[model samples]
Target chain A: HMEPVLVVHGGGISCERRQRVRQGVIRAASLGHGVLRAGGSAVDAVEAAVAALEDDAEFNAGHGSVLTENGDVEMDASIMDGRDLGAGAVSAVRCIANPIKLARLVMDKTPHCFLTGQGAAKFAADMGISEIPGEQLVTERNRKRLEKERQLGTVGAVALDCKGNVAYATSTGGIVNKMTGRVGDSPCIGSGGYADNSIGAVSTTGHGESILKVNLARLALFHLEQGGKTVDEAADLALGYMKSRLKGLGGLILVSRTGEWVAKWTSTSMPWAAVKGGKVHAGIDLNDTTVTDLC
Target chain B: HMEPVLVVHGGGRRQRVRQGVIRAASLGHGVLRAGGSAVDAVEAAVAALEDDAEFNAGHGSVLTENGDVEMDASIMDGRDLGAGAVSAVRCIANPIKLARLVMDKTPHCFLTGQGAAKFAADMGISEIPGEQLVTERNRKRLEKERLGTVGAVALDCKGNVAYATSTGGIVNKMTGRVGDSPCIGSGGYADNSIGAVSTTGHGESILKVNLARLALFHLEQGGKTVDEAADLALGYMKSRLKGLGGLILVSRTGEWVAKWTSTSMPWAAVKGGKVHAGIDLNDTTVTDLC
Candidate 1:
């Protein structure tokens, strides 16, 4: 029983002026197109789409990122398998790009649910993932911001493929000027990211600490499972919590087992996906109601 | 010559169950009533007040204190003389707590003024000193069902108690943490732990970095002049601008100065004497008025 899906992204302050939001949407669209064309799993499509944004510099989480306090690039990431609820995460990791892949590797290969910091780096190196220099993570403008925050951004992805499978991936470059060894919600399992075949999948963005306190992903799941809340309703409630408690603004992308999808945020902007029938769609909100669609 | 000076504090999520707000207010009242040092009372009051709330932790600042990422605090303890201040203060060595006393003790004390005030106002820190202890500062609690912010509570005696000061106060806190207010330097600074001087500001309480206690220590021994000691202390903050913020200074000689170069202009709530004095930075919005 193969179905369709949609992808979306946007809502970054820095991306307002630049083509970064468009680029992120393009990446999501490209992934959906590739998956549909090749009959790939929804997992593969979402992964491809999110990886594109993760590699982009203007969106806050990836290459072009503000620095943390210690002058190190600390990244948080997670992946969940909808088939069996299997999941993996890595936080405060340095010297690794594509943290989702690492999370996937952990889910498929390791005994632990998470990895972090130098240890996480060592794990990636041992796994034969190519290591880029720390400088590769920096952009000229981001480097300047790093003098204060010393940390990077966070990224996430979620998908439901035509083959009845759902999955999610999340990543982050810790807070700016964060203390050494500070880990945000990105890699905290059900906080910033999560997925479930029985219900739906979700990925979050914004202040990591507040997200962690609320365990946003789990809260979304509780609503889906117990309250029978729709994906849109659940995601809205979760984002609202972040807005109230942390005054943070960001987005979330969610997909249910039945191919239903939604993207929501307290910000006027966000990133997301939706798939139905055989067509896939993706976009970012340039303004309220005007979603720049890329399909 | 001891004129009455007012002292106000920042707002935050109240964590203390019983004595937090009361302790601060009482300390201020006590200082004023007993003719104790203004700076000492301010420091003692704030330290006791913040310990009760788990708002701004002793470590790590919060992002959404009130649905916005504005972190600002200030102090003004006038014994009649000039004032001193410090601003921005991301993660400096000394917080504004001690820096205020340095203003009273030094030739060059104010590190920030219009330029710094502009930056602070841009960050949403208040510049104008509103009615003493008005509800707006504590009103956010009503909307969020949370407690009001915390601050150093001090009162000036009715004599020539020149000035006293303290630092390391807080605007907000998350996860029930306390900051430098209780600590000597981080947020609390006092002179004449006995006679008439005391103060408080903002920062981490445990590390006690950038506190004005040393200046008070020198002043107590009659070694360094107020200006000399204040300048020395403020110099330390200038050398490391990452942590410190603002302060309130009161002396036994009836000298009082509230100086802050941080985001918000220093605020005061003296029982007597010009009870309201502060800089106005942001335009007063209806939300602010409420």
Candidate 2:
């Protein structure tokens, strides 16, 4: 009998954003921990956690997402259930406040797995989801970043419930100054996130193009199952390959079928937190980590 | 020393579409015979299919619930693990060409909707009025049903493998609906060390299982031939998820396969100057191409 565990990431971060990033990751970790403690499924845990990340203005997801070259906000999101291999995704959505919820609806309401652009908006309207002004999701902080041209970063969560089911979810405003209608790995299956009860689940963040080229999330799980690597080694090796082979910088949080998990990144730093057995381990700066007991 | 091989598909369970499939296969066959790269051959084949109104890609794409045309496409080159994709695009003459350009032109791997169209326009790809993409046949067919996607896979003399897939999605689908046709590892995948595959059918089901990647995994890790891998992967989809669809595949060794779990899948293959086509399950008609 393994304990339920949840791992969440605010993506590869910089020291400048450490204060806000730290608060965001801790909130996500505790929120997901609450779900696991309430006997929720892994799907629910990851969804709750990622939605929490989306609401925080500190993360590059919903409320504080970066702007495109056109100064508009386009969000991408995805969720996968390992038990049934069910997935839903939305890309290039400008109006949806929480693309993750819309992505969940795509998995539940429609027979299709992915929807984009105007089509996705139509589906959202049909589902009774109200449209938010694209500008509302953008923040003044992100607006300034676009002026200087910035890139990389996403928010994601991977969780495993006591029943052994695993799930992965990711959300992003995409890179700053990206072209409108440009979709990154955030909404792409096998790249942004991959979950399998038989193996493990992974949620990725960083350079979207680089992650797409290697199918980073799925490739990491493949190492675990096929190459017989532990969860930590699999994460390290996968990110290492992305950097060495493609010169891509990124980070991922992985949770194995049992309860083993790791938050690893090839970039300079990643803000992440993991919760298991009523204890939370969180980190932002390299070699700087903290463990605290949950109330 | 193996001869070059090309395989093309017009999707599953449409008998009337065989002639177009043959033409696309012949176009790809010509490319391979002329010593074209596998990437170019698959791109050329998919473009031909996209041009033909009989196929559900560029000109004759299906309609959404609101009677609009949205198309999706993808292309992959196995030699360097290069791939590009576009989805929810409209008005473009050929989404596959746009996908190829994305593979060759930009640092990005996927573009969608307005962004994809803008990139195409910036690249000087011609576009038609959106109405031109809606065919009279598509407009009259009100009943809901699955329309076959178009795809191709090839192994060239240079030992590279490549794949391309394009679709107009299912009839009366949601407006922003993107199927497996443009998604890597679901719609298509190519790897010179393993093989290449292009898939069609139930987009959601195929996406769930990562079907194309699974087929190539069998080829690479399970020691299965291209045909064997296709059959095993399709069989698993059928039994495990009751997934309905078809795929065309080519191994690194230049062997090829076209397999479907549906009642029928029209397919064509060209190798060693011979053309092989099929309209029924497991039945092939071989003839010399002039």
Candidate 3:
């Protein structure tokens, strides 16, 4: 019996001091295991993991968010279907606590690929996603650290279920102290998030402009299509492209239905990733010295 | 009496430091005094100024002129309504040096307006503007401390000669640099430059992409325009748009024109008119305590 489950977390430098950073990875894996034990689909497991992170302030997305220059929360989130190219995104959205759910709603309901600003908020409300007050999303720690982007982190989840289905979801509060109306790469389909059963699925975190310009997720797909490489090879190629061309600083996690996986980044800070059967890993470097497993 | 001449110099912060800067200013004044040709007089003056430090060229344009950025020079000698411009220029044809002569040679010649990068070197043979070769146009003494800029530096003897212009063409070498001179809106237009003209502002600056270009576009086509139209363009750029800097223009017939959108700009001089110019929001506050 193939019990499908997977979970991953973004890394930061000095993982030992950043307890919440590793806790996030453990939480994601726990969610995946819980979903699988309950006979839920891989999509459900990934959504559970994402929901947990959405409530966690240590990561980039969800409740604990940094404000834009306009003193609003311009959040971005996306979800993709690996069986097909279907995707949904929300950008510059305010008043939403979990933009990832709204993005999934957009993917399910609307024909549009993305919605932005007021339009995104409207769509979320119309899609039955809760429209909370902006204050509800603010955290005291996040508000104090808003001047610096210490908490404007991002959250994402990728999964390969028992049925050979793959899905990816990403959510972000973007950078702190960003200009009003600034939309990061998170809500852009091929830029910050992507999935294709023919290749693999990926979600990115980095300098928003750099990711947008290079279309990091799409680049990973291209590597897979043209290079005849595995998911890990393609993800590595895409991450390398972002590092070289855009001078990007962040990490990513890629998962293919074939049990192939890759995680890469240029920042010295570690990102976190946990696979159900493979291993748990965290760190900004590619050195084998940092890999750990908590099975 | 009218003197038609052109003065070209490398670059400098002020006209007094180098003989070339002083020579360019003095020669323009001298040509106006001697009733020489307007194009020739302006060319001579700019060439001489390029060899000075009060303007940006050689030493003056270094900070903003380093790297891939190129020098820009322009001159509009109004007698024939002819204009010349050079962008990303290296070596010294002394843009002002060649521009006036180009006006005399060709029927229609202007350099690098939009999507245009072709050099004007083929229009005339290369000639060394001076033995000094390099000039700094600002207060900075060392090559590392130079600013990017272009200046008319002097408008002489001819009562209605009309226009003159120059600029150190560089981009993003430094922050907050604006090169409005050599731009038709500032001190490069035959219609505006012919009148009374002075360029006092930052260099390597761009506003709303190109504020000077917008002002010039208005000047070229807009009918029954006032100096306010130019002011509107500059104001929109500084306040409503991006980038920074300012400028002033006067017609030969005493049509006064001055527009500055920047909160502060460099000093300016006018020969025949009396106008109060100051830096900062408190217009009475003068810089350098002068």
Residue B3 lDDT, candidate 2, scale 0-100: 82
Model 3: lDDT of residue B227: 84
Candidate 1 regions with alpha-carbon error over 4 angstroms? A6-18, A147-153, A245-248, A271-295, B1-290
- Comparing 1 and 2 on lDDT, the stronger one: 2
* Candidate 1 displacement at residue A144 in angstroms: 2.9
Alpha-carbon RMSD, each predicted model: 19.8, 2.1, 22.8
The local distance difference test score of each candidate is 0.49, 0.88, 0.54
CA deviation > 4 Å runs, candidate 3: A1-5, A11-17, A148-153, A278-295, B1-290
Error of 3 at B130 (Å): 60
TM-score of each model, in listed order:
0.48, 0.95, 0.48
Fnat of each prediction, in sequence: 0.00, 0.80, 0.00
- Greater DockQ among 2 and 3 belongs to 2
Per-residue lDDT value at B76 in model 1:
37
Worst 10 contiguous positions by lDDT, candidate 2 chain B? B139-148
Q: Highest DockQ: which candidate? A: 2
The residue-by-residue lDDT of candidate 2 on B161-260, one tens digit each, is: 9999999888888778888888888899998888899999888888877789889878888556778888888887888788989999988888788888
Interface RMSD of 2: 1.1
Which structure among the candidates has the greatest lDDT?
Answer: 2
Docking level of model 2: medium
| Models sorted by lDDT, best on top | 2, 3, 1
Q: Is candidate 1 or candidate 2 better by DockQ?
A: 2
Question: Candidate 3's residue-wise lDDT over A164-230, tens digit each?
Answer: 7777788888777764444566665666766766666777887765665455766676677665688
